[PDB]
Amino acid sequence: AVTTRQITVPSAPMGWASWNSFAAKIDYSVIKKQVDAFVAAGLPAAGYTYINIDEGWWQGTRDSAGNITVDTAEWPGGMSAITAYIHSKGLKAGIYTDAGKDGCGYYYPTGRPAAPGSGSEGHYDQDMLQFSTWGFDFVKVDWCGGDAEGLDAATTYKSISDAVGRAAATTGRPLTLSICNWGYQNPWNWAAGQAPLWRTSTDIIYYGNQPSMTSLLSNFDQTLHPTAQHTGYYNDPDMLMVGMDGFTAAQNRTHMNLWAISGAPLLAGNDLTTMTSETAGILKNPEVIAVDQDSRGLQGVKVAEDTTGLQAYGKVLSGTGNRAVVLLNRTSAAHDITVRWSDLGLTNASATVRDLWARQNVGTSATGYTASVPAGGSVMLTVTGGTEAAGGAYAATSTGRYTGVTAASTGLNVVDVAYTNNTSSARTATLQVNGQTATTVSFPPTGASAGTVSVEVSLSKGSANTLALSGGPATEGITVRPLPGTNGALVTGKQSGRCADIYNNTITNGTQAELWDCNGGPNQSWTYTSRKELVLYGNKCLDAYNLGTTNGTKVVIWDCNGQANQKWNINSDGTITNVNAGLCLDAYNAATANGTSLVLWSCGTGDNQKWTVT
Numbered sequence: 247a248v249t250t251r252q253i254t255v256p257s258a259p260m261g262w263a264s265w266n267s268f269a270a271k272i273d274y275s276v277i278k279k280q281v282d283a284f285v286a287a288g289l290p291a292a293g294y295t296y297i298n299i300d301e302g303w304w305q306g307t308r309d310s311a312g313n314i315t316v317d318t319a320e321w322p323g324g325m326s327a328i329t330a331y332i333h334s335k336g337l338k339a340g341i342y343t344d345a346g347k348d349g350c351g352y353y354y355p356t357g358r359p360a361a362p363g364s365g366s367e368g369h370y371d372q373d374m375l376q377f378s379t380w381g382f383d384f385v386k387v388d389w390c391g392g393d394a395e396g397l398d399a400a401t402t403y404k405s406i407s408d409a410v411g412r413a414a415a416t417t418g419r420p421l422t423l424s425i426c427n428w429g430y431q432n433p434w435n436w437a438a439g440q441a442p443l444w445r446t447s448t449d450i451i452y453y454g455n456q457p458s459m460t461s462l463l464s465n466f467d468q469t470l471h472p473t474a475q476h477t478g479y480y481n482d483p484d485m486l487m488v489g490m491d492g493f494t495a496a497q498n499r500t501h502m503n504l505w506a507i508s509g510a511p512l513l514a515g516n517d518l519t520t521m522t523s524e525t526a527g528i529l530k531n532p533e534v535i536a537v538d539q540d541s542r543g544l545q546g547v548k549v550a551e552d553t554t555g556l557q558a559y560g561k562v563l564s565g566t567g568n569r570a571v572v573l574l575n576r577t578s579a580a581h582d583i584t585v586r587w588s589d590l591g592l593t594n595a596s597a598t599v600r601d602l603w604a605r606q607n608v609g610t611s612a613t614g615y616t617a618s619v620p621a622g623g624s625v626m627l628t629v630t631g632g633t634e635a636a637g638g639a640y641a642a643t644s645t646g647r648y649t650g651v652t653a654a655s656t657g658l659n660v661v662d663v664a665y666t667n668n669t670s671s672a673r674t675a676t677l678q679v680n681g682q683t684a685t686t687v688s689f690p691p692t693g694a695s696a697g698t699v700s701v702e703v704s705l706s707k708g709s710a711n712t713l714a715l716s717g718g719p720a721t722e723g724i725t726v727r728p729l730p731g732t733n734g735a736l737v738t739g740k741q742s743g744r745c746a747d748i749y750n751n752t753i754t755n756g757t758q759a760e761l762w763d764c765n766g767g768p769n770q771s772w773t774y775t776s777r778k779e780l781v782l783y784g785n786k787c788l789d790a791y792n793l794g795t796t797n798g799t800k801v802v803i804w805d806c807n808g809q810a811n812q813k814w815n816i817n818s819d820g821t822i823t824n825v826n827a828g829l830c831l832d833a834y835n836a837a838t839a840n841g842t843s844l845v846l847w848s849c850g851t852g853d854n855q856k857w858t859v860t
C-alpha cells in the first residue's frame with residue numbers, strides 16, 4: 247500500500263533557445279519573432295516556459311565600472327527590453343555567458359567576428375546581479391574560457407553557483423543555472439547541488455551541419471548517469487533538434503522519447519516561425535511531456551539488450567507500479583523488442599501497457615510486452631498498475647546513517663527517503679553510498695506530515711551497503727527496491743580484494759581499468775552479456791586496447807563494437823580470458839593497491855589473475 251506520500255521534486259526546464267537555428271546571428275527582432283511563434287503555437291500551455299538567449303547578444307564590451315554593455319542597435323532599450331517582452335507573455339527569460347574571461351564567441355567565432363572579453367570571470371557577482379536586475383530567470387554558463395585557461399570545473403562552478411544564489415537573493419527573482427561544460431571533468435560527480443542542470447557531452451549539432459541521429463544517440467548515451475540525477479538536478483543531453491531540417495516526424499518523436507525517458511530538459515531549438523503543425527504536435531504531446539516532467543525526478547536506464555542494438559529503457563515514475571519504457575532499434579532492420587516486468591523491478595503481476603504516440607492502451611500482461619520497432623526507430627510506452635518488487639525498509643542505526651542495506655545483486659536501486667520539512671524552503675543534504683563519490687539531495691517542503699523523495703543509487707551485492715546523510719532534515723526511514731534490468735557484478739581480484747574500477751566515473755573511450763576499493767558504484771558494476779561482453783554504464787565495453795595480443799596490452803573501456811577484443815571467458819579456475827588473445831585479465835605486477843592498472847598477460851596460477859564475478 248501507499249502509506250507515505252511522495253513529494254514532488256522540480257522538473258527539468260522546458261522552453262526554446264536561440265543557438266541550434268541561429269548560432270550567434272541573434273538580436274532583439276530575432277528573439278521577438280520566436281517568442282511570438284512560441285506563443286502562437288500553444289507551447290506555453292504544454293509547459294514550455296523559458297525563452298533562452300544563447301551566444302551572440304554580447305561582444306565582450308564593458309563600461310569603466312565593469313558593467314556589461316550591449317549594442318542597442320541590436321538590442322534597443324538594452325537587455326531589460328527583451329526580458330520585458332518575454333515576461334509580457336507570461337514566460338521566463340534566459341541569458342548566456344562564460345565561466346572564463348572570454349567566451350565561445352571569442353574562442354570559436356560562429357556567425358560573427360571574435361568577441362574578446364565575452365566571459366564573466368572576475369565579475370561573477372557583478373554579472374549575475376546584472377542579469378537578474380535586467381529580469382533574467384535563467385543563465386547558461388559556458389566553458390570556452392574555463393577550458394582555455396585550465397580552470398578546475400567543480401570549484402569554478404561552485405563559485406558561479408554561489409554568485410547565482412546571491413543575485414537571486416538580492417533581486418527576489420529566482421535564477422536557474424545551466425552548467426555548460428560539455429561533460430569535461432565529469433560534471434555528474436559534482437554538479438548536483440550546484441545547479442539544476444549540467445551538460446554531459448559536446449554539442450548535439452555544430453554550425454553548418456545537418457541534424458544527425460548518430461549525434462543524438464551519442465549525446466543520449468553520454469547523459470545516462472542515474473546516480474547523479476534526482477530531486478530537481480538533471481543530466482543535460484543538450485538542446486532539441488526536433489523540427490530541424492532533415493529530421494522526419496519519426497526521428498522527431500524518437501528525439502522526444504529519449505529525452506523524456508532521461509527526464510532531460512526540453513529546450514526546443516528549431517525555427518518556430520516555420521514549424522509544421524505535425525512538429526508542434528510532437529513537441530506538445532502531453533503524455534510524453536508528463537513522462538519527461540515526472541514528479542519523482544528520476545532518470546531512466548537501460549533495462550535490457552538481449553540482442554545487440556535492440557534496447558529497452560525503463561523509467562521509474564511517480565506513484566507505485568508505474569514505468570515509462572522506450573523500445574529503441576539501432577539496427578538497420580525492423581525487429582521485435584521485448585521489455586520484461588522483472589527487468590523493470592515489477593513482479594509478474596498484471597499491468598496495463600499504453601502507447602504514448604497512439605495515445606491508447608494496447609494490452610495487459612503479467613510478464614512483459616513486445617512491439618515491432620522500425621530500423622532506427624522507437625516506441626514510447628507506459629506500464630502502469632503493476633506490482634512493485636519487494637522492497638527493504640530500514641531505520642537509521644545512528645544519526646543520518648543507514649546500515650546493513652541489502653541487494654540481491656550488484657546494481658541500481660531506487661531509494662525512497664522519508665523526512666519532514668515543515669518550512670517554506672527546500673533543504674539539502676550530502677548523501678554518500680558506501681565509499682562512492684558523494685551527491686547532493688534536495689528535500690522540498692512537506693507540510694506537517696512526512697513525505698519521501700527518491701534517489702537512484704548503485705549498491706553492492708550483499709548486506710554491507712551504507713547510506714550516509716550529512717546536513718538537511720532528520721530522515722525517518724528508507725525504502726530500497728532493485729531495478730534488476732541494471733544488474734551487474736563487482737569484478738573482485740582474489741589477491742587484492744579490490745574491484746575492477748574506472749577512475750572517478752569517467753566514460754571516455756580508452757580509459758584504462760584499475761583496482762580500487764570496492765564500493766559498488768556504477769564505475770564498478772559490470773554486466774556480463776550473452777555476447778561475452780563486460781559492460782559498464784550500460785554502454786561501455788571492457789576492451790583489450792587495439793586488439794592487442796601480447797603481455798602488457800592495456801585493458802580499457804570502449805564503446806561496444808562487437809569485436810573479439812571485447813569478449814571475455816569467465817573460467818572455472820577464476821581467470822577471465824580475452825577471447826581474441828587468449829590472455830588473462832591481470833592486475834599489473836601483482837600489485838594490490840588502489841590505482842593498479844589492469845592489463846592482459848599470459849595466464850598462470852597467480853592470484854593477481856584470479857577474480858570473482860557474481
Ligand SMILES: OC[C@H]1O[C@@H](O)[C@H](O)[C@@H](O)[C@H]1O
Pocket residue numbers: 265300301350351356388389390426428448449
Ligand atoms: O557559442 C555558443 C555555443 O557554445 C558551445 O560551447 C555550447 O556548448 C553551445 O550550446 C552554444 O552555447
